[model samples]
Target chain A: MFERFDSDRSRYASLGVVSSLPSGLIDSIWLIIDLNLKGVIPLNDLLHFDLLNNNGKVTVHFSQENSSVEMAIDLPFSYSTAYPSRIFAFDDGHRETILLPAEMLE
Target chain B: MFERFDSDRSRYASLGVVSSLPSGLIDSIWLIIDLNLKGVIPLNDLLHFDLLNNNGKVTVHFSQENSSVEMAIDLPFSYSTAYPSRIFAFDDGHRETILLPAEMLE
Candidate 1:
């Protein structure tokens, strides 16, 4: 279920992850960090990092195929009471999420 | 380029969007929220929400095909100086974002 499809490529920094409820009723929102890097990273290569499974705060270390130095950093995120933001952590197979924190006016 | 492919299904809430740097040389992480609801919400049927593209503090209203009482809520997110948590908004196509807020432990 994993292979480098050369014909299809997508950068992981374009907020490509959209985790939301199809029930269409939710209290969550999604955001993304624009990592303006060169080239594209596919799914097979992406699985190399173990960043998504950890809960609360986590730090991930990555080592690409051609890179010399290992890249690593502590992950930052927010999740407090009613003003928390999060990715979809379920196994529905989608990561893009819809977030809601406060009361939206009509 | 968009169609309701019933043959394949992936809920948007599965943290399917993984937006991060393949360079793997930065300080960011990704997250997801779980809305334990019934059934599955699909794509193609999505794109109905006016969220995501809006900048900072947005309210999205979603009216599913046959659902009554249009459900809506204000989006809560974080983006501050060095401690900002952001989804990949750089157009990388993969939204599973790496949010880096505060300093990750070594």
Candidate 2:
């Protein structure tokens, strides 16, 4: 049971990724945290809107010139000092969950 | 708890991340799986060694022209046709493990 997202510090917001993406292809990528800001931030007028979001799980859209790919960021854990030790990326149809590991970083 | 790594499809090799990283900070990052090659690949010689790493996970060293920050990519599961559901990044010391969530990618 590895750590996931730590919502205590409120510093680094959780963002998702596409595990099936090509290696070494870090292009135009942005995470759209699903927020229920009833009367808060206007979603219609939000683009390149960079800020700290507490939205648990959100839809992330990959921006590219030609190809378009989307995925869901799933966090199954409570936050604290460090991540519980897990990260997942689910596609639209919930077909697959890509788990990106965090170990052996030097 | 949730699926960690799907070691069935044998497609995507697991990769870790830093959960405590700044929002929208996908810079020059790469996962260095800790390989146990006694005489397979020369350890004293590996730069830009990008390839399909069946290596469960090794070590990742961030390369920035200016700042050089490192993290460990830990995947505690099996891989198949979809990532299990977790991605972690550990720094030089055993202080923290960052979990990069993958959900809202569209």
Candidate 3:
């Protein structure tokens, strides 16, 4: 289990209810917890993103740019199952899409 | 318990056996697992870094940039206790300090 002892409260960020994403904007996606980025998964022409809340499993299907071959990666524990919004983009420069944790969302 | 299912072998990075750090240059530190960065701890005048393998506890002492008030943060699970090197600098641009995982280190 991960625990923090700092008196100051920590904050998190995520893409609120992300459904479909534009093609070729993301180089990779990562998990963010307490301002730390972790567990990166590279992306290509990402076609779908499925987050299984029941088991914290992430299944993403993507294809090579300009190719028909479909590829996918199954991340067993991609994000905090309880807080699925903890996922963020790393190199995509979409900082505005990632929102900091707020009471209204929590 | 964290787990990975991708066929590609995952790699980890670390700072061999960091004990002390420079007075400045570091804005924050993070934990890296399977190429994903996680859990950031801000730094001021970081003076000491203690990794307790016995309990997976990390004790770090620091002070305000120019103040003498010694402060500390006890991270209960800062890194994989078994692989203490999983820690890395985030904003320092000292990418060379972080090394990729190898069988010799494991």
Candidate 4:
């Protein structure tokens, strides 16, 4: 279910591995770190070191492919709370970022 | 390009209209406000009252159908800045929120 799709646009950063979702509507599930902040070190570190699962685990599934890649991290907030949008702010008192569901966009 | 697909999940809240993007990879572009905060009045107010385009324009394209609806607001930041992620933080000093592109998720 994974292969490389080449594109000049390398902007889309993939986090974790892409796996199939339970629902038929969603074919896959993935997590991506939207780096809005300027500092590369901080943002890169956030992707590698800072991200935590809903259970406070320190596991991050880094994907090898960029485009057509697949992933998701268990978030503290519900996707419904972010009505009209599939992305939501992920703040843990120390670090802050947004979570985007691949299926929500499709 | 606009049609309705039935789903009990009303969690997907679409902000603006969905139109084709410049890139062939992205068939459509749209804006969505991810409401994270608790107050509905504040979040709804932020959606209807406070959103602006890149040039400070107050125009907001409200979509008709929900599921298969077709939209993009020009953001102040570049998508590349949001490496490994397609979503980004949209803050104008007063109102703050996250912007999720539907194409980014797919």
Candidate 5:
């Protein structure tokens, strides 16, 4: 509840999924592609993933957590459209030339 | 710590308060009247009162709290400008159809 800008700082980009439901809801499925984007999207603290299942012939190893700086990948099926995933944001800190993107982890 | 623009779900409004200082300071004195104002300002969960003191004639009430929705007023001097006062945000919920204003509670 705070916004009254003529300008100073306002940058945003979001992609979501923090769901776990079975009558026990915990949701935050966002989608805000781009808005007032100017510069400032360097939030990497470790996050890696790869999950493809949906007749794409199974490929799973999902469950990784440690986020205070970043590191999250938890997929147990909820997004089905041939769920092929990829998320790596460990920028060039020399961890082997990082920063890969394959359709924004869709 | 969260702002992104380019459409859908962006609204904000703010005004300071919740302060108690002396050594054990607790602060949050905000100011941000309008920022994307499209229309949605009907938040009145009971709040009313006044206070005017500082050689400008002492007139005090200064204490009323019950907020889950809204309701607050507290002043004990920290804002000096002769310190005049007025506040009302009890919006037509028929508690007498209220909506007074005086410099947006500064």
Candidate 6:
């Protein structure tokens, strides 16, 4: 098994890439773990995190006009049980869970 | 042409996947337009919107520590001409814009 690191330190060791869908077109774009965090805080927590520590938080500073957007994700806990775990976008109102695979983590 | 949706509606209809780079492996990951917005809004805007109407915004609820990260993007405007647009991570300190391509906009 792969040696897992602490969410406090090793979480930032991950990397991701950009690829087209269905066709599976791979782009040159990629993103490394620039920062990471833990907790179920709101967006304000992100802002405060940025202003305060800014080091261990998923920080998205720049964004494209309309063509694109960018942001970061900070983990609040460890994911040992889930090998090659996934990220999900859950809409409580719609009661939907969007599973974001590690491949698309970038 | 692929029918385009509105940031208020269609933005939430997009999809993405998770892939392992280098190995060029594709995982089943995808994030549609749960929400879309405009302007350089802070994370607090996300929380407030979630607290208020909870629509037209990019939102992330759960995360896997040391394994994955998750967050959403809110387009402040339109991205019409930039076919296959790109996103970047600009670290003023590092002088880096991690060009996160549209392909990875999950």
* Higher-scoring candidate on lDDT, 3 or 5: 3
**lDDT for residue A8 in candidate 3, whole number 0-100:** 35
TM-score of chain B of each: 0.29, 0.20, 0.26, 0.20, 0.25, 0.23
Q: Candidates' DockQ values?
A: 0.03, 0.09, 0.01, 0.15, 0.01, 0.03
Model 5 earns a TM-score of 0.20
Give residue B105's error in model 4 in angstroms: 3.4
In order, the Cα lDDT scores of the candidates are 0.27, 0.27, 0.30, 0.27, 0.27, 0.23
lDDT of 5 by residue, A1-106 (tens): 3222112333221111111121111111111111211132323333344544545333333222443322232434354443325433232232211122421211
Local error of candidate 2 at residue A104 (angstroms): 23
1 or 5: which has the higher DockQ?
1
Model 3 regions more than 4 Å off: A1-106, B1-48, B52-56, B63-69, B78-106
- Docking level of model 1: incorrect
lDDT of 5 by residue, B1-106 (tens): 3112112333221111111112111111111111211132332333444544545433333222443322232433354443325443232222221122321212
State the lDDT at B52 in candidate 3: 37
| Candidate 1 residue-wise lDDT, B18-46, digit = tens | 22222221221111112211133432232
Candidate 5 displacement at residue A23 in angstroms = 12
Stretches of candidate 2 above 4 Å error?
A1-48, A52-106, B1-47, B52-92, B95-106
User: Whole-model lDDT for model 3 versus the true structure?
Assistant: 0.30
Model 3: clashing residue pairs? A37-B37, A37-B38, A38-B36, A38-B37, A39-B36
Q: lDDT per residue, candidate 4, A1-106, as tens digits?
A: 3111211212222221112112211211222333222221122222222233435422333332133322434443323312222323333333333334442233
Q: Which ten residues in a row have the lowest lDDT in candidate 6 chain B?
A: B20-29
DockQ of 3: 0.01
User: Weakest 10 consecutive residues, lDDT, candidate 6 chain A?
Assistant: A21-30
lDDT of 1 by residue, A1-106 (tens): 4223222322221122222222111211111121311233422222222233235544344344455544444456432232222222111133322222211111
**Global local distance difference test of model 5:** 0.27
Judging by DockQ, tell me the better candidate of 1 and 2: 2
Highest-DockQ candidate: 4
In candidate 3, what are the lDDT values of residues B47-93, reduced to their tens digit?
23333343555554433345455445455444343434323222222
